Every structure is written in structure tokens, then in C-alpha cells.
Amino acid sequence: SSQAWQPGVAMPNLYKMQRMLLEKCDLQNYGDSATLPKGIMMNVAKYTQLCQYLNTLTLAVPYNMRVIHFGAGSDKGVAPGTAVLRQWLPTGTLLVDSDLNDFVSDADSTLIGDCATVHTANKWDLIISDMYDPKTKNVTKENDSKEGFFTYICGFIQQKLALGGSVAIKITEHSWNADLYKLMGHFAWWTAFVTNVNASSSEAFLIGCNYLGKPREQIDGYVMHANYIFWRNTNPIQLSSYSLFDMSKFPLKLRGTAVMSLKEGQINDMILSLLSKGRLIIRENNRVVISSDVLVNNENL
Amino acid sequence: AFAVDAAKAYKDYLASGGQPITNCVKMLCTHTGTGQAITVTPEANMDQESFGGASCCLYCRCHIDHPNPKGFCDLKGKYVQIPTTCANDPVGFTLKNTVCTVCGMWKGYGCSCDQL
Ligand SMILES: N#Cc1cn([C@@H]2O[C@H](CO)[C@@H](O)[C@H]2O)c2ncnc(N)c12
Ligand SMILES: [Zn+2]
Ligand SMILES: [Zn+2]
């Protein structure tokens, strides 16, 4: 295999370069399940593998790093994914999370409500989203690009992701958005990463590595999702929990990446090159302030 | 004058034979850590499991005020190490036990400060 000892499998570059037509996703391992370590939740395993894969990329990791995590609640009322992110991230990292439904979290701050109600004054170094509507998994209707929280995520990235920052956004066969794929071309590199514990599902994390704030590559997002499904359809991934048992190198290395404020005119090619290598973050280093919009109604008489 | 006594209530519910609070978030870790009780990152040793702190706090989990004039949570945002033998009820364990203020180990489950 070799793959079975990795945290998961990233979409090989050649599949990105195709021009496939969208088909239904039919996974051979559908219904297989990995053998999780005793007492470990799927979400803990899935996030652990996501973070293990992110350890292999050129993530910018500044002092006073700012991370925001959408879709962080569970039907259990807790935040397993947040707990893994906080273990992974350097101590002191500012971590905010959010969900439509109430939950209790280890994040430094939590906002409950539709993500579209969330606003922040500051920019972020990493955005993680596990947001998902299981009503999208309806095989009897056409599989078009979805709006909803994906429209929010696309705007949030363009407006509040620091240059140099990275994202990991969860998609599935039916939960996807063409503009989000298009926005992957505004990073120095991108992939769709499938965790080995959840390889029986069409889930992937769309990862954009080192944001550049402009298109480096023009991506047609309808075509790219069809390319992703083609890859999944033709490359069965063996369910595996092997990587969960070795946590010795798990922590994200505190690189102390430089943070600079810069105006548009100053983003020359030497800056762009540092951004592309994970060596620079561009944003203000002010205080982190967030809020949730609250709709007020009085239904008396 | 009136305050709900949530700690006592869980204790009595347990003694009455009720099932312990579940869905405490157990972490993957090396299990070669310091063994201290409450830490900024998982520190379980070979005899412990590490858990996300919020999910093991009675007050966090039951949406009640924290027993503290400040309402500050001892566990939220940290990791709590629980002896493997007691890991079926982390909330009970954290409630019924106390951390040595000198060495950071659980009194009776790592703290050796009272030894000759
Ligand atoms: N559609 C939708 C959304 C789904 N979720 C949450 O994603 C998690 C799915 O694993 C779950 O806990 C859910 O409550 C959303 N959270 C905020 N805003 C939204 N618009 C959504
Ligand atoms: Zn608490
Ligand atoms: Zn002691």
C-alpha cells in the first residue's frame, strides 16, 4: 500500500488536470469502516489525520496565530474537532469556533448561529470548516453547485484570510461549490485530501495552502469537482487507522513566521514568493474581535 | 440563598446507579506524558487517558454556572488526564478528586508529595 500508513490520500496532480464530466460517486469501499482505537470518536480520528497531513505542507505559523473553525459542534453538544485543533496548534494560538447549534468547546471563544451571522474585525491565518447539511445527500436530484454556507466561506476567505494563510473546507459528492474550487487557484497550492479513517465516504477537505489574494491559476469549479469525483470513483482508498497510533510528531511546529502589514502596492513578486513558501503572513496584528448578528423579534399579540 | 447543587446531584445520581456522562472527548496521544492532572496539551502517561477539558466539566456540560465567583472554568481549553481505570466517568472523577497544588498530579493518583 504505503497509502495505508499515511494519514490519508491527496488528489494526485494528474487528476486535477483532466476535463471530466460529473458522474455519480460510487465508492467500492462504501460501507467499510476503519477500526478506531478503543474509545476514540470518528471526529477525533478524522481531525487528527487532517492535521497530520497539514503537517506536511508549508503552513505559515506565526506567533499569536489566529485560527477559526466553522461547523464545530456535534449532535453530542461537544467539539471534538476543536479539541484536536487546540492540541495540534501551538499553545497560545487564538482559536475561535462556531456552529448553528449550541455546544461547549475548548476554543477561546465560541459563536452559536448561522455562519452568515459571524463577523470579525481581524484577519485569520487558518480557516477550518466541517460545515455540512446532510440533506444535500439526495441521489434522486441533480448535483449542482451549492450556495448557502459556501457563499459565506468564499466571501470570508477573500475578505478575512491573511495573505499566506491556509484553509481546509469539508466537501462531499453533493456538498460542494464551484467558486470555492475556483478560489483554490488563489493559493500557491491546493488539493482535496481524504482521510484514511473516513475513506469510504465521498468527503474530502479542500485545502488551499498559502493564500495569494489573486488568481495564480484559473480553475473551472464544475470541471474540478467532476475531476475529484472521477478520482474517487477510480481509486479505492483502503480504510486505515494506522497513523493514529503514532502521535510523536503531531504538534504543529511553531515556525514564528513573520507578520507584516502591507498595502496592495507593496505586494511585489519577492513578497509573493515568500507568501508562496510559507514564510510570510500579511495582515494587521491588532486585537481579535468577533461578533454574531442577532435578529430581534417580538411575537407578543 | 437558594442555589442548585449540581455536584451533589451527580454524585447521588451515580450512587443511585445512573449511567455516567458520556461523550467526553478522548484524545489521541503518545501516553508518554508527564501524568499531571490538567495541562495545556495532552499529557497522559501509560496509565491515563487524556480528554478535552470542556467535555469533562460538569458545569460546562450541563449548562450551569461555574462554582466560582468569577465563573472561570478550570478545565475548558485544557486537557484532563484521567486514570484509565476511571475513564468510564471522567466527569465524576474530576468532581470527586483534587489536584496537588505543588506537583500538579492528582491526589492519590500520582501525587507523591506526602511520602517519606
Ligand atoms: N447548512 C448548513 C450548516 C451546517 N452546520 C453545522 O455543520 C456541522 C455539520 O457537521 C453541524 O454541526 C451543523 O450544525 C452549520 N453551521 C453554521 N452555519 C451553517 N449554515 C451550517
Ligand atoms: Zn467548565
Ligand atoms: Zn503533590
Domain boundaries, chain A: 1-301
Among candidate residues A29, A73, A75, A19, the one with its CA nearest the CA of residue A233:
A29
Resolution for the entry shown, Å: 1.9
Q: Give dist(CA A178, CA A210) in Å, integer.
A: 20
What residues contact residue A34 under an 8 Å CB cut-off, 6+ apart?
A45, A196, A197, A198, A199, A239, A240, A241
Q: B20 with B55: CB under 8 angstroms?
A: no
Catalytic residue among A130, A160, A173, A179: A130
Residues with CB under 6 A from ligand 1: A 71, 73, 99-101, 114-115, 130-133, 148-149
Cβ atoms of residues A290 and A97 within 8 Å:
no
The tally of CA atoms less than 13 A away on the side-chain side of residue A112 is 10
Catalytic, A130? Answer yes
What letter does residue B85 receive in the DSSP assignment? G
Best B23, B24, B25, B38 member to test A by mutation, with max A CBs in 10 Å, is B25
Task: Please give the helix or strand (H or E) that residue B92 lies within, else none.
Answer: helix B90-96
Nearest to A108 among B23, B28, B77 (CB): B77
| Residues A55 and A252 sit within 8 Å (Cβ to Cβ) | yes
Do A95 and A59 contact (CB within 8 A), yes or no? no
A106 and B23 within 8 Å at the Cβ level: the answer is no
Residue of A nearest to B56 (CA): A78
Give the Cα separation of B40 and B44 in Å (integer).
Answer: 12
